From a paper:
One of the key active-site mutations occurred at position 50, which was mutated twice during evolution, first from lysine to histidine (HG3 to HG3.3b) and then from histidine to glutamine (HG3.3b to HG3.7), resulting in a novel catalytic residue ideally positioned for stabilizing negative charge buildup on the phenolic oxygen at the transition state. All HG-series enzymes bound 6NT in the same catalytically productive pose as that observed in HG2 and HG3.17-E47N/N300D. In this pose, the acidic N–H bond of 6NT that mimics the cleavable C–H bond of the substrate is located within hydrogen-bonding distance to the carboxylate oxygen of Asp127 (2.5–2.6 Å distance between heavy atoms), while the basic nitrogen atom corresponding to the phenolic oxygen of the transition state forms an H-bond with either a water molecule (HG3), the Nε atom of His50 (HG3.3b), or the side-chain amide nitrogen of Gln50 (HG3.7, HG3.14, HG3.17). In addition to adopting a cis conformation, which is stabilized by hydrogen bonding to an ordered water molecule, this peptide bond also adopts the trans conformation in the structures of 6NT-bound HG3 and HG3.3b. However, starting at HG3.7, the peptide bond is found exclusively in the cis conformation in the 6NT-bound structures because it is stabilized by an additional hydrogen bond with the Gln50 side-chain carbonyl oxygen. This hydrogen bonding interaction helps to lock Gln50 in a conformation that is properly oriented to stabilize negative charge buildup on the phenolic oxygen at the transition state.
HG3.17 was evolved from HG3, a higher-activity mutant (S265T) of the in silico design HG2 that was engineered post-design to reduce the active-site conformational heterogeneity observed by molecular dynamics analysis of HG25. Over an evolutionary trajectory that yielded the HG3.3b, HG3.7, and HG3.14 intermediates, a total of 17 mutations were introduced into HG3 to produce HG3.17, resulting in a catalytic efficiency increase of approximately three orders of magnitude.
Author numbering:
A (entry chain B), B (entry chain A): 4 to 303
The structure:
């Protein structure tokens, strides 16, 4: 059975997966995505280092391939990350002038979003903006533009494509008692109360064995910020226990504003942490017990 | 135990593999390439659709990543394919003017080769130019420019980087009695007699089970064209029988002008024909029997 179909039958929008051109032309990835998943995200092809490796020199071939494949196969598309220190080329982080950085950031956002205007359901606009203690991470954007870079990014994104749902994303939001989780919720509440157009919080969910249960409490806390949507993104679980995966799915089901879940690849050998076999299909492209456990949960 | 080291000890240049950025950041590919392979090729990142998606506007992010990684890790680099109908964007195949297409082709060759001048051992300049009956394939280049497109491509490439070995590549050159095999020999002999700088013939070797034995006769026939080098490229073998792989390796060893062998990926799940499990490492990144058989053959 298709986990995307089953999650839609439970009132959710999608079960998604990260992919890119050379996954779609190898292995069994295309067949599995066509049958079992409802939304695709670019694993790498929309990051800043992939799309604007030198100023104004945009590289869209990989992203274009993904968008076209998704449209021809009737899949939703997520995009990102527009503003993320981790995939930033050196030409950006060397800028020290506030006006120039504001305009470089705006141009990067606008160019990417305009190119795919109307085709992208979700954009991850700002990623990993928080330190573990809940303060704002001191990236080039914070240091040079100041704390208004987040309002600016979201206002710019809403203008570039008013159809898209605009998300902030972060990791280590998996426990309700962790300071980072409470910090992002209270900042998003205040931003939205001042009119910043943050439509969603996306939780980059990279779990160790046994950590799925904590998401059942963390995700309702993220939803308390009052955004229209929340999502689980980049999901993988070391060991791929059925218990951990089913707990994450049930957290999604329990939270009315949680629109769906995206797993960070199809098959274990193509994972960034392949030795932890953390995905739902094995190296032979066979569904693993965690896949079947999700199916059986969603049927009930 | 490294098949590249062992083939170098037998007097050859390399045992190589095709890869690209998102293979190097996932799985165990980087570790295996570091330990066991001596040359890397771009699986996709130097093809025309990837590098020049609109006229004169070049995308280098993916290819730059691979070249940098190879230099950091002491590996040789192959590049290609500069002129190949199978990865051609639509803007090229809609040109009908001979001068314009000639200039477009020359600019594509010169721009890529200049960017990496001195860093690339081998360039595959022209690919898949022959029909199965040995006539020239009627691609946009043949239809618009005529058969001079092949001489022009090679002369342009030699001027752009005189350090690089320049190859023509084709597939189905695996049997000495197949018409295509003798046809490429006939034409390469004629082009070299006219001063065209074709340094190598690269045989894109996609075998079915039991076809390795025929390479023992086909590869010496390809070498009879008199090029300084020949190579085995894009190698994969359905079923990955040790006998097939060893026969291909011994064909290389038997042909003085054969500089090396490149396999078309690391692990089975990442193959274009993964269901045929045709590579040297399995879906758990373990070396398969064919890998160990190559090790023993190179020591014997
Ligand atoms: O959910 N995702 O797998 C995913 C992948 C890449 C991304 N970049 N930004 N947001 C992303 C989400
Ligand atoms: O040998 N190769 O694997 C390989 C891969 C891609 C290519 N493009 N042109 N030549 C190529 C060789």
């Amino acid at each position: 059975q298709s986990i995307d179909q089953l999650i839609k039958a439970r009132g959710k929008v999608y079960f998604g997966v990260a992919t890119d051109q050379n996954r779609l032309t190898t292995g069994k990835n295309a067949a599995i995505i066509k049958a079992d998943f409802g939304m695709v995200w670019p694993e790498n092809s929309m990051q800043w280092d992939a799309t604007e490796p030198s100023q104004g020199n945009f590289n869209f071939a990989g992203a274009d391939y993904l968008v076209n494949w998704a449209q021809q196969n009737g899949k939703l598309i997520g995009g990102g990350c527009l503003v993320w220190h981790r995939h930033l080329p050196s030409w950006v982080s060397s800028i020290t002038d506030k006006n120039t950085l504001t305009n470089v950031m705006k141009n990067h956002i606008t160019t990417l979003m305009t190119r795919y205007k109307g085709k992208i359901r979700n954009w991850d606009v700002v990623g990993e903006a928080f330190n573990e203690d809940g303060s704002l991470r001191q990236t080039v954007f914070l240091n040079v533009i100041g704390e208004d870079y987040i309002p600016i990014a979201f206002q710019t994104a809403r203008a570039a494509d008013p159809n898209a749902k605009l998300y902030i994303m972060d990791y280590n939001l998996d426990s309700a008692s962790y300071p980072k989780t409470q910090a992002i919720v209270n900042r998003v509440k205040q931003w939205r109360a001042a009119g910043v157009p943050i439509d969603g919080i996306g939780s980059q969910t990279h779990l160790s064995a046994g950590q799925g249960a904590g998401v059942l409490q963390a995700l309702p806390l993220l939803a308390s910020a009052g955004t229209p949507e929340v999502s689980i993104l980049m999901l993988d679980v070391a060991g791929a226990s059925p218990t951990d995966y089913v707990n994450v799915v049930n957290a999604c089901l329990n939270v009315q504003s949680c629109v769906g879940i995206t797993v960070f690849g199809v098959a274990d050998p193509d994972s960034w942490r392949a030795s932890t076999t953390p995905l739902l299909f094995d190296g032979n492209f066979n569904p693993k017990p965690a896949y079947n456990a999700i199916v059986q949960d969603l049927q009930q």
